[PDB]
Amino acid sequence: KRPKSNQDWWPSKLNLEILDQNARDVGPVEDDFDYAEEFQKLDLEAVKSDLEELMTSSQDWWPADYGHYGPLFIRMAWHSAGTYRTADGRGGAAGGRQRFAPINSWPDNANLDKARRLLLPIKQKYGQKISWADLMILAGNVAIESMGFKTFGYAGGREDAFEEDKAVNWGPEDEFETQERFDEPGEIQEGLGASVMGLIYVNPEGPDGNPDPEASAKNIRQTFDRMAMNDKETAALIAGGHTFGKVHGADDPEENLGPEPEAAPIEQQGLGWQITAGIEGPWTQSPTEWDMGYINNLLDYEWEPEKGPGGAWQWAPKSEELKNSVPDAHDPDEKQTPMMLTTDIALKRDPDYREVMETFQENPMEFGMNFAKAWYKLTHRDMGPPERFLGPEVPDEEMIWQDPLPDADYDLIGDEEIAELKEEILDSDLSVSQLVKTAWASASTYRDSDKRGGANGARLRLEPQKNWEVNEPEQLETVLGTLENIQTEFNDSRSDGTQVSLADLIVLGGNAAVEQAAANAGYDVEIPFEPGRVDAGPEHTDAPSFDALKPKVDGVRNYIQDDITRPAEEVLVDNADLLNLTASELTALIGGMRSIGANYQDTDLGVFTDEPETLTNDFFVNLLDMGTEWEPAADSEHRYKGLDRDTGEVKWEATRIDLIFGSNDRLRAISEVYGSADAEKKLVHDFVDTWSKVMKLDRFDLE
Amino acid sequence: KRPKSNQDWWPSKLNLEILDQNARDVGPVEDDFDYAEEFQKLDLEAVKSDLEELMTSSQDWWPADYGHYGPLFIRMAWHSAGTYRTADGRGGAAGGRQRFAPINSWPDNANLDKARRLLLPIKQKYGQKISWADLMILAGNVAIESMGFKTFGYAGGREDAFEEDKAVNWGPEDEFETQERFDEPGEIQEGLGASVMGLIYVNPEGPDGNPDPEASAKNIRQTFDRMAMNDKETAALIAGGHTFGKVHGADDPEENLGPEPEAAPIEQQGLGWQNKNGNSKGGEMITAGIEGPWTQSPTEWDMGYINNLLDYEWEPEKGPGGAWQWAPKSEELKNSVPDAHDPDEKQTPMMLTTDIALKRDPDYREVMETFQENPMEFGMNFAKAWYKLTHRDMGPPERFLGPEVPDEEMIWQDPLPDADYDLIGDEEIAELKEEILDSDLSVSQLVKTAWASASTYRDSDKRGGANGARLRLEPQKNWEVNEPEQLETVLGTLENIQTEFNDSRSDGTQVSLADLIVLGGNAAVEQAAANAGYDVEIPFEPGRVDAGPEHTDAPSFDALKPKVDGVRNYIQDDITRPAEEVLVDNADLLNLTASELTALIGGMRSIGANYQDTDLGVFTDEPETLTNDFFVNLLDMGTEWEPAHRYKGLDRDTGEVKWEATRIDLIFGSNDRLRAISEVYGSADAEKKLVHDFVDTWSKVMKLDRFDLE
Ligand code: HEM
Ligand code: HEM
Ligand SMILES: O=C(NO)c1ccccc1O
Ligand SMILES: O=C(NO)c1ccccc1O
């Protein structure tokens, strides 16, 4: 018997369960587990040696193609990191969530359950010293290296998750291997980096199953772009990956494939699918060796469409010299002919991709360099700054996509200087509101999904953040200019090697403002402050890549972009999850911010108080007062007005962001707590703890 | 774009989320929040004073019928506690989950959103000193008391939840007011206290909407019984409750009813059912579909309902909407009742099929007759039933808080006698512990006995547990799963040890069989761990007493009889739900997280505490030793499993003979989340971790019913 909660009845229901995942770390590992220090005890070279042995250790329950598991593990690794989307930074190898449903049962992940199982003995051998996440990427690397290609490098540090990431919308499809997110090649549903559900990037047979290489290329380009890869990286990755292995399909899988892992019998112990997708054949003459075979086969010969016995589309070589030029995967006394997918032909038919592939063939070294770099990025893009990259194989070179941070070449401020700076900030002409908005704009770009954003680095002062509409550029410049004057003033007055960064000052200023707002309400609060943040420069900032962090809805500032799809409150919850907030923390934060008044354009939306810049629970008290009736504003699709029953007296204006806390059942229970006559101090303390939490999200230093 | 989980793709998936709920306590309230401690500060009478005032303080947005909210609050309280099922003890007002979906949106709870909103000002005034759950029940009490009827009392102590309970599978039907749980009135599905999902007990118009009083009575008796109420109680509650208020519905019972709370526009702020006849518009109020009061004085306590029911004849009728109701056949009642809003208008009393059932049914009739001839007996059984109804899931007397708690401890409360002696000290606990290990009892015996004792506890209605040692009493001493003959042997030895100890004290120190049972289990686990090379000191908290048959309602404890027990690998060969689904359900009653459950099962298998000493899931060569052998062997890819709820584990090579297990053991290597946990405990560096986790889980289960010291 399976219960039908309020998530299966009404679609327009907020999914607060995603925030509940932040209130607890499920799993048997101690809640204070420090994976980093455990990984440091790991003999990485010994793990690689075991993986090397495993590569050619064909098991009977699942014999290795060509006597080598390398290709299978590369696909495995690529699938693990392939779900990444720049829109929210979700997906990616980070937590090894591929091991859980629904991802572990997608059609495109067929038989990856076998690959992972082959690694079980190694995982058990090293235990907590190496995560599944790290181990899967490491297997990919060893496969590539064992087959003749030295990788760019490798870093451990990916902590294992013990449940699926519920906060991930994979698409509007109720079915797998089918799509309903695009009509024209190059216009898929915004955000998602895949053109088809259950699929990773695009349809292997071509757009909508049609063998149109040119149209496929447009989808490939758009989707890889949403996975943070450009033309050169994309071409290098596809060509590089398909230099190895083959496609599996001895007939039609739609009629020769078994129950996916999640639907398989208990006796199958987590394994399922016991022909993956009709298409059959290798790309090159030597599927287990790094060479120029893929590029040569594609460019040097003409290819044409062909429907296999399963009805699936693949491409065959017009030539006859390539006929039976490839040994069979399991039958020695047999041969096979190289094949190509519509997505491979796309790389030759598209003018831009063709130019890249021609240069690659012309300069084999350039192909290697691009594949190496792209493979390293693909598998480490969601690990955050260099500080999180661990182990002896971490490259000495830091890549710009890691959003690097410089070293603090000076002594850090102490308790005395911290109080001094705090005092001078509040004594300046900066208001509590300016300080809070600036600190929020600096810290709120952080996302726990791929660990990008955050106040460290003070990139708020650089492009593109300094000019984002939501940050109100003109007003932002005033606050940053003033804090920069304070920084100069402090640094020049130091008698020793002590200095303060602008990154720290912005956060210190926010803390001071919150402390001041609480003092105005009669509460004495001291927010813990941790110095050490540094200021990153433009040369170490990939401006365009930060566009992904630009918010469409910002609850704290009551900001809603003019053209959004889903309800404002849905985006708000999605955004709250990126900041690792629970439902109560999200509520305390919004409610308290409204009493302060930190709205974009300084509007009074949701500011249900007559004493601005005073941290109280007035937001809740007034929101819950039945003496007020709410109604949509005439000729306004964002604003709502609170009128006080039916007397008409217009008191208060608000958006859906504010009203959801009095409408959603669970949020209303939290609001009723904060809106009680004995909860003001409780709200103040919860608001401060949440503010402090957000300010320290990118401080992986202390862990 | 709603991110579907996995239930939409694989409906028969394990609902582990119910266990994740035990891993954390969502909500703003502090981690170490002690509601009991807060309620104790509350000025109860002051709250009752404000509620009494509220009863007649009509609010513009939802005026009180007859100028009194009393009836509405009684229904509200009735609905808060009416979802209780004895099968799992879930439901009931305990956590006030009525405020959350999907319950707050059941057609049955129409406009109860308005009732709760009316109490919001009072909730804000007293804050955490009184929970929504306690406040809703109190409002019901005050309503009854303010209308002329005195209650048996009231007790606080219901802590508020901040999310719905993902555990209660309210109904198999994927739609409201529809049922696939019964074809013939009286044979409703097993595990439900309602005849139709979305409903509390039965259909007001009769089974499947047919005005059949006889069949209706059969469903009423069955559903109420599943909610722990007998004929007398059932009739008292229905008659007592319908003595007040009226039904709402002068138009179509399915037309004016606006969107449910969960679907209402954001500006409505949680209030739904935009009915064209309930909020504000002087006149006819509507909720259900039938219209008209039961008595002529809807806001006064009297014999009106019973008198009006038995003294006159009633006939079925398709009112305004097709909804069945019963009207009098005499003109003596025509226009005899004042309108709910317009006193210048007259209204005629009506009856529901469920009301007539109390007349048409022979057993119920004898009750109603006795009631009419003995008002005192009617009001008395109503008071008792109302008290039990609203306090059924509160647990033992120790949890009943406040100045209005009846001095009388009810048998249904699973009473516990006080300790009339001094508690044993750290030195005696050591001597007794050693003496236990020096007897002829094995580790398996001591572990199985301690488990059978503490495993009856369920967090739902706070019933069961090791305290009281009811394992030695009926009916537990004879439950098949406890292996009576074998249990008796163990109880005999421990009792002798109890007799010798007590009769050797040079003061007033004594030990209970209950404490020795738990102490014996701790010693056995400690020994098993020692047999594995680990030194552990399981915390022990003396104080458990021995309850007698006088403190035990035997028939009621049968509800705690397990159909499946993972720890002992016991599976009743006649269950409908998969074994693993029941295992997770039971694990949730023990407040376990997925990891705690996994550690507990794995550890128990290494010790070998199976029912009938079978080798099911016992993947180890060193029985009575606490290791991670269960996981190491479970993850062995060299084994191929196949059906025998038994399965056979075969070695990949050749044919041969190997392991055997049940779905309970195999699910830990099949389900994705459980397998991930199993992989941790089955790793080379996790044996000690598993031992420590097992011990911590064992200790937790052993003290689940310890409220006596909170
Ligand atoms: C436009 C994007 C892509 C498409 C449509 C595509 C698709 C496909 C298909 C249909 C298969 C066969 C699955 C099977 O064995 O039955 C396969 C496999 C394979 N793929 Fe891709 N792929 C993409 C990109 C990539 C990239 C970026 C890499 C890694 C850098 C990679 C690496 C591999 C490897 C090594 C294999 C062969 C595995 C084996 O023999 O077992 N793929 N691909
Ligand atoms: C066989 C079980 C029962 C059935 C089918 C049923 C029936 C119904 C229906 C259809 C309504 C009208 C809802 C509306 O339009 O306002 C109502 C209300 C009412 N019920 Fe019951 N009921 C049962 C029992 C009980 C019990 C056990 C109690 C409490 C001791 C109770 C208490 C009340 C009160 C006080 C009202 C009137 C609410 C008012 O004026 O606002 N009920 N019931
Ligand atoms: O996209 C794939 N791999 O990258 C894929 C693999 C197997 C079957 C269908 C697919 O779409
Ligand atoms: O009990 C009820 N109201 O109090 C009730 C109301 C509607 C349908 C079924 C029911 O049991």
CSV table of N, CA, C and O in Angstrom, one decimal, chain A residues 1 3-4 7-10 13 17 20 24 26-28 30 60 101-102 117 124 128 132 164 173-174 176 260 262 266 269 584 645 659 662 665 668 672 675 677-678 682, chain B residues 4 6-10 13 24 26-28 30 60 101 117 124 128 132 164 169 174 260 262 269 576-577 581 595 652 663 666-667 669 672-673 675 679 682 684-685 689:
chain,number,residue,atom,x,y,z
A,1,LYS,N,0.8,-1.2,0.0
A,1,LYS,CA,0.0,0.0,0.0
A,1,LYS,C,0.9,1.3,0.0
A,1,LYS,O,1.8,1.4,0.8
A,3,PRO,N,0.6,5.4,0.2
A,3,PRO,CA,-0.2,6.6,0.5
A,3,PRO,C,-0.1,7.7,-0.6
A,3,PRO,O,0.9,7.9,-1.3
A,4,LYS,N,-1.2,8.4,-0.8
A,4,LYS,CA,-1.2,9.5,-1.8
A,4,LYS,C,-1.3,10.8,-1.1
A,4,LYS,O,-2.3,11.4,-0.8
A,7,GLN,N,1.1,15.7,-2.7
A,7,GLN,CA,2.1,15.9,-3.8
A,7,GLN,C,1.6,15.2,-5.0
A,7,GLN,O,2.1,15.4,-6.1
A,8,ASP,N,0.7,14.3,-4.8
A,8,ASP,CA,0.1,13.4,-5.9
A,8,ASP,C,-1.3,13.8,-6.2
A,8,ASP,O,-1.9,13.4,-7.2
A,9,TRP,N,-1.9,14.7,-5.3
A,9,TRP,CA,-3.3,15.2,-5.5
A,9,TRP,C,-3.3,16.5,-6.3
A,9,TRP,O,-3.8,16.5,-7.4
A,10,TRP,N,-2.6,17.5,-5.8
A,10,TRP,CA,-2.6,18.8,-6.4
A,10,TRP,C,-1.1,19.1,-6.9
A,10,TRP,O,-0.2,19.1,-6.1
A,13,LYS,N,1.3,22.3,-5.6
A,13,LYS,CA,1.7,22.3,-4.2
A,13,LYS,C,3.2,22.4,-4.0
A,13,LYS,O,4.0,21.6,-4.7
A,17,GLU,N,9.5,19.3,1.0
A,17,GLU,CA,10.3,18.2,1.4
A,17,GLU,C,11.7,18.4,1.1
A,17,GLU,O,12.6,17.8,1.7
A,20,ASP,N,13.3,20.0,3.9
A,20,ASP,CA,13.4,19.0,5.0
A,20,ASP,C,14.7,18.3,4.9
A,20,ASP,O,15.3,17.9,6.0
A,24,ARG,N,18.5,17.6,8.2
A,24,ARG,CA,19.1,16.3,8.6
A,24,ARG,C,20.0,15.6,7.6
A,24,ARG,O,19.6,15.6,6.4
A,26,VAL,N,20.8,12.3,6.4
A,26,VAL,CA,20.5,10.9,6.6
A,26,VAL,C,21.7,10.0,6.3
A,26,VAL,O,22.7,10.5,5.7
A,27,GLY,N,21.7,8.8,6.7
A,27,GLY,CA,22.9,8.0,6.5
A,27,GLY,C,23.5,7.5,7.9
A,27,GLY,O,23.3,8.2,8.9
A,28,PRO,N,24.3,6.4,7.9
A,28,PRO,CA,24.9,5.9,9.1
A,28,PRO,C,26.2,6.6,9.6
A,28,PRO,O,26.6,6.5,10.7
A,30,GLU,N,28.6,9.3,11.1
A,30,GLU,CA,28.5,10.3,12.2
A,30,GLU,C,28.2,11.7,11.6
A,30,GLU,O,28.8,12.1,10.6
A,60,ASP,N,32.7,-13.4,-14.8
A,60,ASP,CA,31.8,-14.3,-15.6
A,60,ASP,C,30.4,-13.7,-15.6
A,60,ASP,O,29.7,-13.7,-16.7
A,101,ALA,N,17.5,6.1,-7.1
A,101,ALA,CA,16.4,6.3,-8.0
A,101,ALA,C,16.2,7.8,-7.9
A,101,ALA,O,16.4,8.5,-6.9
A,102,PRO,N,15.6,8.4,-9.0
A,102,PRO,CA,15.2,7.7,-10.3
A,102,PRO,C,16.4,7.6,-11.2
A,102,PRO,O,16.3,6.9,-12.2
A,117,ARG,N,28.9,-2.2,-9.6
A,117,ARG,CA,29.0,-3.5,-8.8
A,117,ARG,C,30.4,-4.0,-8.9
A,117,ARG,O,30.9,-4.5,-7.9
A,124,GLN,N,34.7,-1.6,-0.6
A,124,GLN,CA,34.7,-2.3,0.7
A,124,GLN,C,36.1,-2.3,1.3
A,124,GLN,O,36.3,-2.2,2.5
A,128,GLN,N,35.5,4.1,4.3
A,128,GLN,CA,35.2,5.5,4.3
A,128,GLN,C,36.4,6.4,3.8
A,128,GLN,O,36.2,7.6,3.6
A,132,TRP,N,32.0,6.8,-2.9
A,132,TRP,CA,31.5,6.2,-4.1
A,132,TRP,C,31.7,7.2,-5.2
A,132,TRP,O,32.2,6.9,-6.3
A,164,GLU,N,18.4,10.5,-2.8
A,164,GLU,CA,18.3,11.2,-4.0
A,164,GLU,C,18.2,12.7,-3.7
A,164,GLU,O,17.8,13.0,-2.5
A,173,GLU,N,8.2,15.3,-18.6
A,173,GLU,CA,7.9,14.0,-19.1
A,173,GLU,C,7.6,13.0,-18.0
A,173,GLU,O,8.3,12.8,-17.0
A,174,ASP,N,6.4,12.3,-18.2
A,174,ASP,CA,6.0,11.3,-17.2
A,174,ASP,C,6.5,10.0,-17.8
A,174,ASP,O,6.4,8.9,-17.2
A,176,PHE,N,10.0,7.9,-19.9
A,176,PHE,CA,11.4,7.9,-20.2
A,176,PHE,C,11.7,7.7,-21.7
A,176,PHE,O,10.8,7.1,-22.3
A,260,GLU,N,14.0,-2.2,-14.9
A,260,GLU,CA,15.1,-1.3,-14.4
A,260,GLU,C,15.3,-1.7,-12.9
A,260,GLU,O,14.5,-2.3,-12.3
A,262,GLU,N,15.1,-0.2,-10.0
A,262,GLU,CA,14.0,0.1,-9.0
A,262,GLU,C,12.8,-0.8,-9.2
A,262,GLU,O,12.0,-1.0,-8.2
A,266,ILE,N,13.5,-8.5,-5.8
A,266,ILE,CA,14.4,-8.3,-4.6
A,266,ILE,C,15.6,-9.3,-4.7
A,266,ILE,O,16.7,-8.9,-4.2
A,269,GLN,N,19.0,-8.2,-6.1
A,269,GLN,CA,19.8,-7.4,-5.3
A,269,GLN,C,20.4,-6.1,-5.9
A,269,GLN,O,21.6,-5.9,-6.0
A,584,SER,N,11.9,26.3,8.3
A,584,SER,CA,11.8,27.3,9.4
A,584,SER,C,12.9,28.4,9.3
A,584,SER,O,12.6,29.6,9.6
A,645,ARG,N,-10.3,43.5,6.6
A,645,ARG,CA,-11.7,43.0,6.3
A,645,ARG,C,-12.2,43.6,5.1
A,645,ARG,O,-11.7,43.4,4.0
A,659,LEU,N,3.0,36.4,1.0
A,659,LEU,CA,1.8,35.7,1.3
A,659,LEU,C,1.8,34.2,1.4
A,659,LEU,O,1.0,33.6,2.1
A,662,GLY,N,1.5,32.6,4.8
A,662,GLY,CA,0.2,32.5,5.5
A,662,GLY,C,-0.7,31.7,4.7
A,662,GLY,O,-1.9,31.4,5.2
A,665,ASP,N,0.2,25.4,4.1
A,665,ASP,CA,-0.1,24.7,5.4
A,665,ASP,C,1.1,24.6,6.4
A,665,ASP,O,1.0,25.0,7.6
A,668,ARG,N,2.5,28.1,7.3
A,668,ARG,CA,1.7,28.8,8.2
A,668,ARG,C,1.8,28.3,9.6
A,668,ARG,O,1.7,29.1,10.6
A,672,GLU,N,2.8,30.9,12.6
A,672,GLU,CA,1.9,31.0,13.8
A,672,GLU,C,2.8,31.0,15.0
A,672,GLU,O,2.4,31.5,16.1
A,675,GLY,N,4.6,34.4,15.2
A,675,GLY,CA,3.6,35.4,15.4
A,675,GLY,C,2.9,35.4,16.7
A,675,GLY,O,1.9,36.1,16.9
A,677,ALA,N,2.7,35.9,21.0
A,677,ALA,CA,3.2,36.9,21.9
A,677,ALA,C,4.4,36.6,22.7
A,677,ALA,O,4.9,37.5,23.5
A,678,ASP,N,4.9,35.4,22.6
A,678,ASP,CA,6.1,35.0,23.3
A,678,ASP,C,7.2,34.6,22.4
A,678,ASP,O,8.2,34.0,22.9
A,682,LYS,N,12.6,34.7,20.2
A,682,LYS,CA,12.8,33.4,19.4
A,682,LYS,C,13.1,33.7,18.0
A,682,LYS,O,14.0,33.2,17.3
B,4,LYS,N,8.7,15.0,-9.6
B,4,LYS,CA,8.2,13.8,-9.1
B,4,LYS,C,9.3,13.0,-8.4
B,4,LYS,O,10.5,13.1,-8.8
B,6,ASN,N,9.7,9.1,-6.9
B,6,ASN,CA,9.9,7.8,-7.4
B,6,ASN,C,8.6,6.9,-7.3
B,6,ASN,O,8.5,5.9,-8.0
B,7,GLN,N,7.7,7.4,-6.5
B,7,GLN,CA,6.4,6.7,-6.3
B,7,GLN,C,5.6,6.7,-7.6
B,7,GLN,O,4.8,5.8,-7.9
B,8,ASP,N,5.8,7.8,-8.4
B,8,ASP,CA,5.0,7.9,-9.7
B,8,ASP,C,5.6,7.0,-10.8
B,8,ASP,O,4.8,6.7,-11.7
B,9,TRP,N,6.8,6.6,-10.6
B,9,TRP,CA,7.4,5.7,-11.6
B,9,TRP,C,7.4,4.3,-11.1
B,9,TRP,O,7.1,3.3,-11.9
B,10,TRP,N,7.7,4.1,-9.8
B,10,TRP,CA,7.7,2.8,-9.2
B,10,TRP,C,6.8,2.8,-7.9
B,10,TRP,O,7.3,2.8,-6.8
B,13,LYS,N,7.3,1.2,-4.4
B,13,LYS,CA,8.6,1.5,-3.8
B,13,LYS,C,8.5,1.7,-2.3
B,13,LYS,O,7.4,2.0,-1.8
B,24,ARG,N,14.9,13.7,12.1
B,24,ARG,CA,14.9,15.1,12.5
B,24,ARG,C,13.5,15.6,12.9
B,24,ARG,O,12.5,14.9,12.7
B,26,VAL,N,11.4,18.7,12.2
B,26,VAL,CA,11.2,19.9,11.5
B,26,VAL,C,10.4,20.9,12.4
B,26,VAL,O,9.8,20.4,13.4
B,27,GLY,N,10.4,22.1,12.1
B,27,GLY,CA,9.7,23.1,12.9
B,27,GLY,C,10.7,24.0,13.5
B,27,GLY,O,11.9,23.7,13.7
B,28,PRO,N,10.3,25.2,14.0
B,28,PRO,CA,11.1,26.2,14.6
B,28,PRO,C,11.5,25.9,16.1
B,28,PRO,O,12.6,26.3,16.5
B,30,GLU,N,12.9,24.7,19.5
B,30,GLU,CA,14.2,24.2,19.9
B,30,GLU,C,14.3,22.7,19.9
B,30,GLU,O,13.3,22.0,20.0
B,60,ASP,N,-17.3,38.1,12.1
B,60,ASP,CA,-17.8,38.6,10.8
B,60,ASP,C,-17.6,37.6,9.7
B,60,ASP,O,-18.5,37.2,8.9
B,101,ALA,N,-2.2,19.0,5.1
B,101,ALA,CA,-2.8,18.2,4.0
B,101,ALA,C,-2.2,16.8,4.2
B,101,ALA,O,-1.1,16.6,4.8
B,117,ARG,N,-9.2,28.6,12.7
B,117,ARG,CA,-8.8,30.0,12.6
B,117,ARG,C,-9.4,30.9,13.7
B,117,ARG,O,-8.8,31.8,14.2
B,124,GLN,N,-2.1,32.5,19.9
B,124,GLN,CA,-1.1,33.5,19.9
B,124,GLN,C,-0.8,34.1,21.3
B,124,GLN,O,0.3,34.5,21.7
B,128,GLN,N,3.6,28.8,23.1
B,128,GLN,CA,4.0,27.4,23.2
B,128,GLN,C,3.5,26.7,24.5
B,128,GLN,O,3.6,25.5,24.6
B,132,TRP,N,-1.6,23.4,19.4
B,132,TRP,CA,-2.8,23.4,18.7
B,132,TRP,C,-3.7,22.1,19.0
B,132,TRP,O,-4.9,22.2,19.2
B,164,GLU,N,2.9,16.5,8.1
B,164,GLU,CA,2.0,15.4,8.1
B,164,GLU,C,2.7,14.1,8.4
B,164,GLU,O,4.0,14.1,8.2
B,169,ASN,N,-1.4,5.3,5.8
B,169,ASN,CA,-2.0,5.0,4.5
B,169,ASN,C,-3.5,5.1,4.6
B,169,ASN,O,-4.2,4.0,4.6
B,174,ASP,N,-7.7,5.9,-4.7
B,174,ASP,CA,-7.1,7.2,-5.1
B,174,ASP,C,-8.1,8.3,-5.4
B,174,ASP,O,-8.0,8.9,-6.5
B,260,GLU,N,-10.6,23.2,-2.1
B,260,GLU,CA,-10.1,22.8,-0.7
B,260,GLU,C,-9.0,23.7,-0.3
B,260,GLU,O,-8.3,24.3,-1.2
B,262,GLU,N,-5.9,23.4,0.4
B,262,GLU,CA,-4.6,23.2,-0.4
B,262,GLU,C,-4.7,23.7,-1.8
B,262,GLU,O,-3.7,23.7,-2.5
B,269,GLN,N,-5.4,32.8,2.1
B,269,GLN,CA,-4.6,32.5,3.3
B,269,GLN,C,-4.9,31.2,4.1
B,269,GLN,O,-5.1,31.3,5.3
B,576,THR,N,-1.2,-9.2,3.5
B,576,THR,CA,-1.4,-8.7,2.1
B,576,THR,C,-0.2,-7.8,1.6
B,576,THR,O,0.2,-7.9,0.5
B,577,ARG,N,0.3,-7.0,2.5
B,577,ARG,CA,1.4,-6.1,2.2
B,577,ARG,C,2.7,-6.8,2.2
B,577,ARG,O,2.9,-7.7,3.0
B,581,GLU,N,7.5,-3.7,3.6
B,581,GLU,CA,6.6,-2.5,3.8
B,581,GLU,C,6.2,-2.5,5.3
B,581,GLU,O,6.2,-1.5,5.9
B,595,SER,N,19.0,4.0,9.0
B,595,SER,CA,20.3,3.5,9.5
B,595,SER,C,20.2,2.7,10.8
B,595,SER,O,20.9,1.7,11.0
B,652,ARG,N,27.3,-18.9,-7.1
B,652,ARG,CA,27.3,-18.8,-8.6
B,652,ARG,C,27.8,-20.1,-9.3
B,652,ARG,O,27.1,-20.5,-10.3
B,663,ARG,N,12.5,-11.9,2.8
B,663,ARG,CA,12.5,-10.6,2.1
B,663,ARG,C,13.0,-9.5,3.1
B,663,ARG,O,13.6,-8.5,2.7
B,666,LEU,N,16.8,-9.7,2.7
B,666,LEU,CA,17.1,-9.3,1.3
B,666,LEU,C,16.9,-7.8,0.9
B,666,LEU,O,17.7,-7.3,0.1
B,667,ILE,N,15.9,-7.2,1.5
B,667,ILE,CA,15.6,-5.8,1.1
B,667,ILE,C,16.8,-4.9,1.4
B,667,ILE,O,17.0,-4.0,0.7
B,669,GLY,N,19.7,-5.4,0.7
B,669,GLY,CA,20.7,-5.5,-0.4
B,669,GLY,C,20.0,-5.3,-1.7
B,669,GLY,O,20.7,-5.4,-2.8
B,672,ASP,N,17.7,0.7,-2.9
B,672,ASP,CA,18.9,1.6,-3.2
B,672,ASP,C,19.4,2.3,-1.9
B,672,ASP,O,20.6,2.3,-1.7
B,673,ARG,N,18.5,2.9,-1.1
B,673,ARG,CA,19.0,3.6,0.1
B,673,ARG,C,19.5,2.6,1.1
B,673,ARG,O,20.5,2.9,1.8
B,675,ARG,N,20.7,-0.4,0.6
B,675,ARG,CA,21.9,-1.0,0.2
B,675,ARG,C,23.1,-0.1,0.4
B,675,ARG,O,24.2,-0.5,0.8
B,679,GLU,N,26.3,-1.1,2.5
B,679,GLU,CA,27.7,-1.1,1.9
B,679,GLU,C,28.6,-0.4,2.9
B,679,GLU,O,29.8,-0.7,3.0
B,682,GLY,N,29.2,-3.0,5.7
B,682,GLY,CA,29.8,-4.2,5.2
B,682,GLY,C,31.3,-3.9,4.7
B,682,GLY,O,31.8,-4.7,4.0
B,684,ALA,N,35.4,-2.9,5.2
B,684,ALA,CA,36.5,-3.4,6.1
B,684,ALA,C,36.8,-2.6,7.3
B,684,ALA,O,37.3,-3.2,8.3
B,685,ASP,N,36.5,-1.3,7.3
B,685,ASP,CA,36.8,-0.5,8.5
B,685,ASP,C,35.5,-0.1,9.3
B,685,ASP,O,35.6,0.8,10.1
B,689,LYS,N,32.1,0.3,14.2
B,689,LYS,CA,31.1,1.3,14.0
B,689,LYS,C,29.7,0.7,14.1
B,689,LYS,O,28.8,1.2,14.7
